[PDB]
């Protein structure tokens, strides 16, 4: 499995941007281009199904698995308070068998199928967010927040609220920032601090598929045949979406 490490011991904005580009560069097919734009497109499915992301602090490493065909989250690996490596996985994304190739460190009996699903709503319910709209939006984003949430699972007893909070941040700070340069630029502008998320972040995240199919089938030379609205205003130029990666939709036109 390919692994990409983010070092969180005094990171720089340039190192985080290079890390995001390594994700994009691993999954994209450089031969595909949709709607006459140059946005990177994820390639077709292959036998190399998973990508391993390592978050390294000075206290240890916590790893996250993502699918290479769509960047969905699949599992995470962390040591518990007795220093045993444990892997936690979403059954609809990966099997116990394939999980031993993704995280060879965890044996079969140290694998645990998660009890909730990987959609944001279900992780958010398990994160027990009591403020505002009760979604991930209220937790914010930022390198320092990823580090604090990572440390709450690293060599600690499993606690569903900490785990779910970690997942919400880790997924957004890897797969969503790879897809959406608006979100990447927010992290970069506020580096390394924790900062508020906004509705535009949430709107991009739920519209990846509508954005990708509109560029593929309803755009010519980077301009949409009609106005689109994903909740943050009417858009006609594809470059206002600041896209980092589109979903794979096959061969262009």
PDB file of C-alpha atoms in Angstrom:
ATOM      1  CA  UNK A   1       0.000   0.000   0.000  1.00  0.00           C
ATOM      2  CA  UNK A   2       1.310   3.536  -0.643  1.00  0.00           C
ATOM      3  CA  UNK A   3       1.594   5.658   2.491  1.00  0.00           C
ATOM      4  CA  UNK A   4       1.875   9.422   2.797  1.00  0.00           C
ATOM      5  CA  UNK A   5       2.988  10.963   6.066  1.00  0.00           C
ATOM      6  CA  UNK A   6       2.016  14.300   7.500  1.00  0.00           C
ATOM      7  CA  UNK A   7       4.511  15.373  10.185  1.00  0.00           C
ATOM      8  CA  UNK A   8       2.670  17.403  12.827  1.00  0.00           C
ATOM      9  CA  UNK A   9       5.719  18.356  14.914  1.00  0.00           C
ATOM     10  CA  UNK A  10       6.007  22.077  14.032  1.00  0.00           C
ATOM     11  CA  UNK A  11       4.730  21.844  10.453  1.00  0.00           C
ATOM     12  CA  UNK A  12       4.832  24.612   7.871  1.00  0.00           C
ATOM     13  CA  UNK A  13       2.087  25.725   5.468  1.00  0.00           C
ATOM     14  CA  UNK A  14       4.318  24.691   2.532  1.00  0.00           C
ATOM     15  CA  UNK A  15       4.689  21.185   3.970  1.00  0.00           C
ATOM     16  CA  UNK A  16       0.902  20.833   4.422  1.00  0.00           C
ATOM     17  CA  UNK A  17       0.296  22.000   0.788  1.00  0.00           C
ATOM     18  CA  UNK A  18       2.877  19.532  -0.500  1.00  0.00           C
ATOM     19  CA  UNK A  19       1.134  16.772   1.515  1.00  0.00           C
ATOM     20  CA  UNK A  20      -2.220  17.671  -0.076  1.00  0.00           C
ATOM     21  CA  UNK A  21      -0.621  17.599  -3.534  1.00  0.00           C
ATOM     22  CA  UNK A  22       0.829  14.146  -2.880  1.00  0.00           C
ATOM     23  CA  UNK A  23      -2.709  12.871  -2.248  1.00  0.00           C
ATOM     24  CA  UNK A  24      -3.963  14.455  -5.470  1.00  0.00           C
ATOM     25  CA  UNK A  25      -0.920  13.225  -7.406  1.00  0.00           C
ATOM     26  CA  UNK A  26      -1.405   9.663  -6.159  1.00  0.00           C
ATOM     27  CA  UNK A  27      -5.065   9.220  -7.284  1.00  0.00           C
ATOM     28  CA  UNK A  28      -5.327  11.374 -10.375  1.00  0.00           C
ATOM     29  CA  UNK A  29      -5.121  10.182 -13.949  1.00  0.00           C
ATOM     30  CA  UNK A  30      -3.159  12.937 -15.740  1.00  0.00           C
ATOM     31  CA  UNK A  31      -4.716  11.889 -19.088  1.00  0.00           C
ATOM     32  CA  UNK A  32      -8.269  12.868 -18.186  1.00  0.00           C
ATOM     33  CA  UNK A  33      -9.760  16.328 -18.428  1.00  0.00           C
ATOM     34  CA  UNK A  34     -13.394  17.339 -18.226  1.00  0.00           C
ATOM     35  CA  UNK A  35     -15.344  20.380 -19.434  1.00  0.00           C
ATOM     36  CA  UNK A  36     -12.266  21.885 -21.095  1.00  0.00           C
ATOM     37  CA  UNK A  37     -10.654  22.581 -17.698  1.00  0.00           C
ATOM     38  CA  UNK A  38      -7.307  21.489 -16.265  1.00  0.00           C
ATOM     39  CA  UNK A  39      -8.683  20.329 -12.881  1.00  0.00           C
ATOM     40  CA  UNK A  40      -7.184  16.961 -11.842  1.00  0.00           C
ATOM     41  CA  UNK A  41      -9.548  13.966 -12.175  1.00  0.00           C
ATOM     42  CA  UNK A  42      -9.374  10.795 -10.039  1.00  0.00           C
ATOM     43  CA  UNK A  43      -8.458   7.784 -12.212  1.00  0.00           C
ATOM     44  CA  UNK A  44     -10.428   4.581 -12.734  1.00  0.00           C
ATOM     45  CA  UNK A  45     -10.580   1.821 -10.108  1.00  0.00           C
ATOM     46  CA  UNK A  46      -7.607  -0.552  -9.935  1.00  0.00           C
ATOM     47  CA  UNK A  47      -6.239  -3.332  -7.768  1.00  0.00           C
ATOM     48  CA  UNK A  48      -4.388  -0.770  -5.601  1.00  0.00           C
ATOM     49  CA  UNK A  49      -7.591   0.043  -3.769  1.00  0.00           C
ATOM     50  CA  UNK A  50      -6.350   1.890  -0.682  1.00  0.00           C
ATOM     51  CA  UNK A  51      -4.088   4.778   0.344  1.00  0.00           C
ATOM     52  CA  UNK A  52      -2.552   5.011   3.831  1.00  0.00           C
ATOM     53  CA  UNK A  53      -2.163   8.394   5.525  1.00  0.00           C
ATOM     54  CA  UNK A  54       0.038   8.618   8.614  1.00  0.00           C
ATOM     55  CA  UNK A  55      -0.296  11.499  11.090  1.00  0.00           C
ATOM     56  CA  UNK A  56       2.934  11.714  13.086  1.00  0.00           C
ATOM     57  CA  UNK A  57       3.274  13.645  16.350  1.00  0.00           C
ATOM     58  CA  UNK A  58       6.127  13.480  18.892  1.00  0.00           C
ATOM     59  CA  UNK A  59       4.001  10.950  20.890  1.00  0.00           C
ATOM     60  CA  UNK A  60       3.258   8.408  18.143  1.00  0.00           C
ATOM     61  CA  UNK A  61       1.448   7.884  14.839  1.00  0.00           C
ATOM     62  CA  UNK A  62      -2.262   7.466  14.050  1.00  0.00           C
ATOM     63  CA  UNK A  63      -3.080   6.297  10.498  1.00  0.00           C
ATOM     64  CA  UNK A  64      -6.116   6.717   8.274  1.00  0.00           C
ATOM     65  CA  UNK A  65      -7.109   4.616   5.239  1.00  0.00           C
ATOM     66  CA  UNK A  66      -8.829   6.209   2.201  1.00  0.00           C
ATOM     67  CA  UNK A  67     -10.166   4.569  -0.903  1.00  0.00           C
ATOM     68  CA  UNK A  68      -8.153   5.526  -4.017  1.00  0.00           C
ATOM     69  CA  UNK A  69     -11.136   5.418  -6.398  1.00  0.00           C
ATOM     70  CA  UNK A  70     -13.171   8.079  -4.581  1.00  0.00           C
ATOM     71  CA  UNK A  71     -11.266   9.233  -1.443  1.00  0.00           C
ATOM     72  CA  UNK A  72     -13.897   7.850   0.943  1.00  0.00           C
ATOM     73  CA  UNK A  73     -12.711   6.999   4.457  1.00  0.00           C
ATOM     74  CA  UNK A  74     -12.267   3.277   5.188  1.00  0.00           C
ATOM     75  CA  UNK A  75     -10.603   2.786   8.594  1.00  0.00           C
ATOM     76  CA  UNK A  76      -8.137   4.163  11.146  1.00  0.00           C
ATOM     77  CA  UNK A  77      -5.291   2.618  13.162  1.00  0.00           C
ATOM     78  CA  UNK A  78      -4.264   3.754  16.646  1.00  0.00           C
ATOM     79  CA  UNK A  79      -2.522   2.240  19.661  1.00  0.00           C
ATOM     80  CA  UNK A  80      -4.694   1.950  22.768  1.00  0.00           C
ATOM     81  CA  UNK A  81      -3.588   2.673  26.358  1.00  0.00           C
ATOM     82  CA  UNK A  82      -1.686  -0.642  26.619  1.00  0.00           C
ATOM     83  CA  UNK A  83       0.237   0.126  23.429  1.00  0.00           C
ATOM     84  CA  UNK A  84      -1.603  -2.430  21.328  1.00  0.00           C
ATOM     85  CA  UNK A  85      -2.208  -1.501  17.662  1.00  0.00           C
ATOM     86  CA  UNK A  86      -5.959  -1.592  16.903  1.00  0.00           C
ATOM     87  CA  UNK A  87      -7.631  -1.061  13.538  1.00  0.00           C
ATOM     88  CA  UNK A  88     -11.205   0.250  13.291  1.00  0.00           C
ATOM     89  CA  UNK A  89     -13.109  -0.051  10.049  1.00  0.00           C
ATOM     90  CA  UNK A  90     -16.223   0.722   8.101  1.00  0.00           C
ATOM     91  CA  UNK A  91     -17.575  -2.579   6.762  1.00  0.00           C
ATOM     92  CA  UNK A  92     -19.117  -1.058   3.636  1.00  0.00           C
ATOM     93  CA  UNK A  93     -15.688   0.227   2.537  1.00  0.00           C
ATOM     94  CA  UNK A  94     -13.278  -2.591   3.404  1.00  0.00           C
ATOM     95  CA  UNK A  95     -13.221  -6.199   4.622  1.00  0.00           C
ATOM     96  CA  UNK A  96     -11.231  -7.662   7.529  1.00  0.00           C
ATOM     97  CA  UNK A  97      -9.095  -9.511   4.944  1.00  0.00           C
ATOM     98  CA  UNK A  98      -8.067  -6.393   2.990  1.00  0.00           C
ATOM     99  CA  UNK A  99      -7.572  -4.485   6.259  1.00  0.00           C
ATOM    100  CA  UNK A 100      -4.637  -6.772   7.092  1.00  0.00           C
ATOM    101  CA  UNK A 101      -2.871  -5.510   3.921  1.00  0.00           C
ATOM    102  CA  UNK A 102      -3.670  -1.858   4.692  1.00  0.00           C
ATOM    103  CA  UNK A 103      -2.611  -2.049   8.373  1.00  0.00           C
ATOM    104  CA  UNK A 104      -0.318  -5.106   8.697  1.00  0.00           C
ATOM    105  CA  UNK A 105       0.486  -3.989  12.236  1.00  0.00           C
ATOM    106  CA  UNK A 106      -2.976  -4.993  13.498  1.00  0.00           C
ATOM    107  CA  UNK A 107      -3.813  -8.706  13.813  1.00  0.00           C
ATOM    108  CA  UNK A 108      -7.291 -10.067  13.082  1.00  0.00           C
ATOM    109  CA  UNK A 109      -8.524 -10.117  16.658  1.00  0.00           C
ATOM    110  CA  UNK A 110      -7.285  -6.490  17.057  1.00  0.00           C
ATOM    111  CA  UNK A 111      -9.563  -5.303  14.231  1.00  0.00           C
ATOM    112  CA  UNK A 112     -12.962  -3.840  15.217  1.00  0.00           C
ATOM    113  CA  UNK A 113     -15.861  -3.150  12.847  1.00  0.00           C
ATOM    114  CA  UNK A 114     -17.291   0.297  13.649  1.00  0.00           C
ATOM    115  CA  UNK A 115     -20.880   0.328  14.862  1.00  0.00           C
ATOM    116  CA  UNK A 116     -21.880   3.436  12.850  1.00  0.00           C
ATOM    117  CA  UNK A 117     -21.742   4.321   9.132  1.00  0.00           C
ATOM    118  CA  UNK A 118     -19.257   6.570   7.343  1.00  0.00           C
ATOM    119  CA  UNK A 119     -21.743   9.255   6.197  1.00  0.00           C
ATOM    120  CA  UNK A 120     -21.137  12.560   7.979  1.00  0.00           C
ATOM    121  CA  UNK A 121     -24.572  12.548   9.676  1.00  0.00           C
ATOM    122  CA  UNK A 122     -23.854   9.250  11.456  1.00  0.00           C
ATOM    123  CA  UNK A 123     -20.312  10.164  12.502  1.00  0.00           C
ATOM    124  CA  UNK A 124     -21.630  13.530  13.728  1.00  0.00           C
ATOM    125  CA  UNK A 125     -24.321  11.834  15.811  1.00  0.00           C
ATOM    126  CA  UNK A 126     -21.520   9.746  17.394  1.00  0.00           C
ATOM    127  CA  UNK A 127     -19.402  12.871  18.027  1.00  0.00           C
ATOM    128  CA  UNK A 128     -22.152  14.304  20.319  1.00  0.00           C
ATOM    129  CA  UNK A 129     -21.916  17.937  19.217  1.00  0.00           C
ATOM    130  CA  UNK A 130     -24.216  20.001  21.434  1.00  0.00           C
ATOM    131  CA  UNK A 131     -23.617  23.491  20.046  1.00  0.00           C
ATOM    132  CA  UNK A 132     -25.243  25.277  17.152  1.00  0.00           C
ATOM    133  CA  UNK A 133     -26.499  23.132  14.290  1.00  0.00           C
ATOM    134  CA  UNK A 134     -24.974  19.977  15.858  1.00  0.00           C
ATOM    135  CA  UNK A 135     -22.869  19.225  12.746  1.00  0.00           C
ATOM    136  CA  UNK A 136     -19.100  19.121  12.081  1.00  0.00           C
ATOM    137  CA  UNK A 137     -19.306  22.726  11.138  1.00  0.00           C
ATOM    138  CA  UNK A 138     -19.361  23.696  14.824  1.00  0.00           C
ATOM    139  CA  UNK A 139     -16.014  21.943  15.553  1.00  0.00           C
ATOM    140  CA  UNK A 140     -13.954  24.181  13.243  1.00  0.00           C
ATOM    141  CA  UNK A 141     -10.917  23.131  11.177  1.00  0.00           C
ATOM    142  CA  UNK A 142      -7.145  23.741  11.399  1.00  0.00           C
ATOM    143  CA  UNK A 143      -3.831  22.014  12.023  1.00  0.00           C
ATOM    144  CA  UNK A 144      -3.863  22.602  15.783  1.00  0.00           C
ATOM    145  CA  UNK A 145      -7.358  21.089  15.998  1.00  0.00           C
ATOM    146  CA  UNK A 146      -6.229  17.961  14.022  1.00  0.00           C
ATOM    147  CA  UNK A 147      -3.292  17.579  16.418  1.00  0.00           C
ATOM    148  CA  UNK A 148      -5.441  17.844  19.563  1.00  0.00           C
ATOM    149  CA  UNK A 149      -8.048  15.369  18.297  1.00  0.00           C
ATOM    150  CA  UNK A 150      -5.329  12.991  17.060  1.00  0.00           C
ATOM    151  CA  UNK A 151      -3.721  13.078  20.503  1.00  0.00           C
ATOM    152  CA  UNK A 152      -7.022  12.214  22.163  1.00  0.00           C
ATOM    153  CA  UNK A 153      -6.950   8.818  20.344  1.00  0.00           C
ATOM    154  CA  UNK A 154      -3.183   8.167  20.269  1.00  0.00           C
ATOM    155  CA  UNK A 155      -2.319   5.588  22.972  1.00  0.00           C
ATOM    156  CA  UNK A 156      -5.605   6.130  24.779  1.00  0.00           C
ATOM    157  CA  UNK A 157      -8.581   3.946  25.565  1.00  0.00           C
ATOM    158  CA  UNK A 158     -11.185   4.126  22.801  1.00  0.00           C
ATOM    159  CA  UNK A 159     -13.941   6.678  23.488  1.00  0.00           C
ATOM    160  CA  UNK A 160     -16.562   6.961  20.757  1.00  0.00           C
ATOM    161  CA  UNK A 161     -16.914  10.754  21.071  1.00  0.00           C
ATOM    162  CA  UNK A 162     -13.134  11.330  20.726  1.00  0.00           C
ATOM    163  CA  UNK A 163     -12.906   8.846  17.858  1.00  0.00           C
ATOM    164  CA  UNK A 164     -15.803  10.362  15.940  1.00  0.00           C
ATOM    165  CA  UNK A 165     -14.446  13.871  16.464  1.00  0.00           C
ATOM    166  CA  UNK A 166     -11.038  12.744  15.242  1.00  0.00           C
ATOM    167  CA  UNK A 167     -12.591  11.202  12.110  1.00  0.00           C
ATOM    168  CA  UNK A 168     -14.606  14.325  11.280  1.00  0.00           C
ATOM    169  CA  UNK A 169     -11.466  16.478  11.354  1.00  0.00           C
ATOM    170  CA  UNK A 170      -9.100  13.971   9.765  1.00  0.00           C
ATOM    171  CA  UNK A 171     -11.384  13.300   6.796  1.00  0.00           C
ATOM    172  CA  UNK A 172     -11.894  17.039   6.099  1.00  0.00           C
ATOM    173  CA  UNK A 173      -8.174  17.766   6.468  1.00  0.00           C
ATOM    174  CA  UNK A 174      -7.158  15.094   3.923  1.00  0.00           C
ATOM    175  CA  UNK A 175      -9.872  14.104   1.426  1.00  0.00           C
ATOM    176  CA  UNK A 176     -11.993  17.298   1.442  1.00  0.00           C
ATOM    177  CA  UNK A 177      -8.981  19.623   1.183  1.00  0.00           C
ATOM    178  CA  UNK A 178      -7.701  17.448  -1.711  1.00  0.00           C
ATOM    179  CA  UNK A 179     -11.054  17.915  -3.492  1.00  0.00           C
ATOM    180  CA  UNK A 180     -11.627  21.585  -2.683  1.00  0.00           C
ATOM    181  CA  UNK A 181      -8.992  24.309  -2.837  1.00  0.00           C
ATOM    182  CA  UNK A 182     -11.326  26.732  -1.061  1.00  0.00           C
ATOM    183  CA  UNK A 183     -10.940  24.578   2.089  1.00  0.00           C
ATOM    184  CA  UNK A 184      -7.214  24.081   1.579  1.00  0.00           C
ATOM    185  CA  UNK A 185      -6.758  27.887   1.313  1.00  0.00           C
ATOM    186  CA  UNK A 186      -8.680  28.404   4.545  1.00  0.00           C
ATOM    187  CA  UNK A 187      -6.283  26.063   6.404  1.00  0.00           C
ATOM    188  CA  UNK A 188      -3.273  27.856   4.804  1.00  0.00           C
ATOM    189  CA  UNK A 189      -4.475  31.419   5.485  1.00  0.00           C
ATOM    190  CA  UNK A 190      -4.975  30.558   9.180  1.00  0.00           C
ATOM    191  CA  UNK A 191      -1.937  28.293   9.549  1.00  0.00           C
ATOM    192  CA  UNK A 192      -1.539  26.537  12.002  1.00  0.00           C
ATOM    193  CA  UNK A 193      -4.444  27.712  14.112  1.00  0.00           C
ATOM    194  CA  UNK A 194      -7.901  26.329  14.724  1.00  0.00           C
ATOM    195  CA  UNK A 195     -10.490  28.491  12.858  1.00  0.00           C
ATOM    196  CA  UNK A 196     -14.243  28.520  12.283  1.00  0.00           C
ATOM    197  CA  UNK A 197     -15.708  26.507   9.429  1.00  0.00           C
ATOM    198  CA  UNK A 198     -18.575  28.167   7.427  1.00  0.00           C
ATOM    199  CA  UNK A 199     -21.554  27.092   5.315  1.00  0.00           C
ATOM    200  CA  UNK A 200     -19.481  27.314   2.143  1.00  0.00           C
ATOM    201  CA  UNK A 201     -17.215  24.511   3.399  1.00  0.00           C
ATOM    202  CA  UNK A 202     -20.253  22.299   4.121  1.00  0.00           C
ATOM    203  CA  UNK A 203     -21.855  23.212   0.759  1.00  0.00           C
ATOM    204  CA  UNK A 204     -18.756  22.218  -1.203  1.00  0.00           C
ATOM    205  CA  UNK A 205     -18.514  18.914   0.729  1.00  0.00           C
ATOM    206  CA  UNK A 206     -22.063  17.802  -0.071  1.00  0.00           C
ATOM    207  CA  UNK A 207     -21.825  18.873  -3.726  1.00  0.00           C
ATOM    208  CA  UNK A 208     -18.707  17.064  -4.966  1.00  0.00           C
ATOM    209  CA  UNK A 209     -20.748  14.818  -7.207  1.00  0.00           C
ATOM    210  CA  UNK A 210     -23.090  17.532  -8.559  1.00  0.00           C
ATOM    211  CA  UNK A 211     -20.058  19.721  -9.271  1.00  0.00           C
ATOM    212  CA  UNK A 212     -18.153  16.969 -11.044  1.00  0.00           C
ATOM    213  CA  UNK A 213     -21.058  15.875 -13.230  1.00  0.00           C
ATOM    214  CA  UNK A 214     -21.944  19.462 -14.180  1.00  0.00           C
ATOM    215  CA  UNK A 215     -18.337  20.154 -15.330  1.00  0.00           C
ATOM    216  CA  UNK A 216     -18.223  16.866 -17.185  1.00  0.00           C
ATOM    217  CA  UNK A 217     -21.577  17.228 -18.958  1.00  0.00           C
ATOM    218  CA  UNK A 218     -22.746  20.859 -18.845  1.00  0.00           C
ATOM    219  CA  UNK A 219     -19.546  22.884 -19.253  1.00  0.00           C
ATOM    220  CA  UNK A 220     -17.590  23.938 -22.354  1.00  0.00           C
ATOM    221  CA  UNK A 221     -14.162  25.561 -22.160  1.00  0.00           C
ATOM    222  CA  UNK A 222     -14.579  26.098 -18.391  1.00  0.00           C
ATOM    223  CA  UNK A 223     -17.994  27.780 -18.555  1.00  0.00           C
ATOM    224  CA  UNK A 224     -21.264  26.196 -17.519  1.00  0.00           C
ATOM    225  CA  UNK A 225     -24.079  26.247 -20.106  1.00  0.00           C
ATOM    226  CA  UNK A 226     -26.354  27.806 -17.432  1.00  0.00           C
ATOM    227  CA  UNK A 227     -26.093  29.138 -13.878  1.00  0.00           C
ATOM    228  CA  UNK A 228     -25.437  26.657 -11.069  1.00  0.00           C
ATOM    229  CA  UNK A 229     -26.001  27.327  -7.364  1.00  0.00           C
ATOM    230  CA  UNK A 230     -24.489  25.123  -4.635  1.00  0.00           C
ATOM    231  CA  UNK A 231     -25.652  27.504  -1.928  1.00  0.00           C
ATOM    232  CA  UNK A 232     -22.984  30.245  -2.028  1.00  0.00           C
ATOM    233  CA  UNK A 233     -24.237  32.211  -5.053  1.00  0.00           C
ATOM    234  CA  UNK A 234     -24.884  31.690  -8.736  1.00  0.00           C
ATOM    235  CA  UNK A 235     -21.858  30.455 -10.651  1.00  0.00           C
ATOM    236  CA  UNK A 236     -21.139  30.320 -14.397  1.00  0.00           C
ATOM    237  CA  UNK A 237     -17.305  30.130 -14.483  1.00  0.00           C
ATOM    238  CA  UNK A 238     -15.918  26.749 -13.308  1.00  0.00           C
ATOM    239  CA  UNK A 239     -12.871  28.567 -11.895  1.00  0.00           C
ATOM    240  CA  UNK A 240     -15.013  30.222  -9.174  1.00  0.00           C
ATOM    241  CA  UNK A 241     -15.366  26.735  -7.598  1.00  0.00           C
ATOM    242  CA  UNK A 242     -11.585  26.463  -6.991  1.00  0.00           C
ATOM    243  CA  UNK A 243     -11.699  22.696  -7.503  1.00  0.00           C
ATOM    244  CA  UNK A 244      -8.733  20.470  -6.603  1.00  0.00           C
ATOM    245  CA  UNK A 245     -10.018  17.070  -7.792  1.00  0.00           C
ATOM    246  CA  UNK A 246     -13.036  15.812  -9.655  1.00  0.00           C
ATOM    247  CA  UNK A 247     -14.754  12.455  -9.325  1.00  0.00           C
ATOM    248  CA  UNK A 248     -13.946   9.850 -11.982  1.00  0.00           C
ATOM    249  CA  UNK A 249     -16.789   9.725 -14.520  1.00  0.00           C
ATOM    250  CA  UNK A 250     -15.065   7.756 -17.300  1.00  0.00           C
ATOM    251  CA  UNK A 251     -13.759   9.097 -20.606  1.00  0.00           C
ATOM    252  CA  UNK A 252     -14.423  12.727 -21.415  1.00  0.00           C
ATOM    253  CA  UNK A 253     -17.327  13.615 -23.679  1.00  0.00           C
TER     254      UNK A 253
END
